[PDB]
Amino acid sequence: FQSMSVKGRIYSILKQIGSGGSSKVFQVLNEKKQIYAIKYVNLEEADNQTLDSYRNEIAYLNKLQQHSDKIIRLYDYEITDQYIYMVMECGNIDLNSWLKKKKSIDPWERKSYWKNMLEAVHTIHQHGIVHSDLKPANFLIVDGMLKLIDFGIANQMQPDTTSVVKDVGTVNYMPPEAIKDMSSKSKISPKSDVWSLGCILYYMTYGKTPFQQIINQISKLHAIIDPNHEIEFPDIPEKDLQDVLKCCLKRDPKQRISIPELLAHPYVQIQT
Ligand SMILES: Cn1cc(-c2ccc(Nc3ccc(C#N)c(NC4CCCCC4)n3)cc2OCC#N)cn1
Ligand SMILES: [Mg+2]
Ligand SMILES: [Mg+2]
Ligand SMILES: [Mg+2]
């Protein structure tokens, strides 16, 4: 068994939630037997670019605490030359693990989750942050409410397993312009997050991502950028939801709907 100290407060580790690179997230208990998640970053072999990404993520997470409750709570942190400890709320489950377990999603829960994500992403955009790598794993379900966990500034972590692993990230939420930018101008804009949000909502509507069927990677990337590749939008009773999806998944970012527009859309506004 293991334990840890953060700004003079002791926590006992229950299990490891996730890990990625020099980072680990643990489910812990304080002295009062209250649950938290602690992200541990080992900085021993970290370069100045990796260091600055962890510093920038902490500064933005702390700054944005007061601006939205759709951003994960950061209670405390410790930073030295050797490590980082971040004390956060634990939550119930990340949105990716939740979507993989769920068979059918209630239209009211899908709508409520959509509103939470728009608000979180809108808040970061207002502070000049574009995530550019949004996936369901970036969102935490905390008592039926979605909260953005990270800002895409530091390295991404994957959930851990207690079994021996056999062989990775996802390409299913990647904007078409993120692919086109690699050969070449900034390219990136708040619209890149709209596309990724659109892929998440598409998953919550049709049970798959827009290009989940394409197993091959080079053929998937081609399909995301190809204008002749028609994305299927099967008819559903929620006509407003069908329009949101079509407007989020436009290949030209200039034609793609914005976050302020999505917040005034009937899907989010009509019937509360
Ligand atoms: C059945 N299941 C539950 C989870 C889960 C997943 C995440 C969290 N809480 C947090 C709280 C903070 C962070 C950070 N930073 C974080 N990161 C994970 C890393 C792996 C990918 C998902 C996000 N996860 C709590 C979670 O469950 C409650 C606990 N412990 C995953 N599968
Ligand atoms: Mg598992
Ligand atoms: Mg397993
Ligand atoms: Mg297992």
Q: Determine contact, residues 120/146, Cβ cutoff 8 Å.
A: yes
The DSSP letter of residue 39 is: E
Strand-pairing partners, residue 29, are 12, 35
Catalytic residue (one of 94, 133, 150, 193):
133
Resolution in A: 2.0
Identify the three-state secondary structure at position 167: coil
Distance CA 88, CA 76 (A): 7
Q: Dig out the tokens for 263 from the structure.
A: 């917040």
Residue 71 phi/psi, 5-degree rounding, is -115, 135
The domain that contains 58 carries what CATH number?
3.30.200.20
The domain that contains 227 carries what CATH number?
1.10.510.10
Report whether residue 20 contacts ligand 1, using a CB cutoff of 6 Å.
no
Q: Determine contact, residues 38/28, Cβ cutoff 8 Å.
A: yes
The label of the residue with tokens 């209670």 reads 75
Q: Which of 50, 146, 168 is nearest to 99 (CA)?
A: 146
Verify that 149 and 243 share a domain, yes or no. Answer: yes
Residue 195: which residues within 8 A CB-CB, separation 6 or more?
Answer: 173, 175, 176, 248, 249, 253, 256
Distance spanning both ends of the chain, measured CA to CA: 48
Residue 127: which residues within 8 A CB-CB, separation 6 or more?
Answer: 60, 63, 64, 67
Residue 16 phi/psi, 5-degree rounding, is -95, 120
Residue 221: which residues within 8 A CB-CB, separation 6 or more?
Answer: 171, 174, 179
Q: Determine contact, residues 78/85, Cβ cutoff 8 Å.
A: yes
Q: Which of 124, 150, 126 is nearest to 136 (CA)?
A: 150
252 belongs to the catalytic site: no
Domain that holds residue 71: 4-92
73-74-77 Cα angle (round to 5): 170
Query: Any known ligand binding at 163?
Result: no
Verify that 234 and 112 share a domain, yes or no. Answer: yes
Report whether residue 91 contacts ligand 1, using a CB cutoff of 6 Å.
yes
Report whether residue 175 contacts ligand 1, using a CB cutoff of 6 Å.
no
Experimental method: X-ray
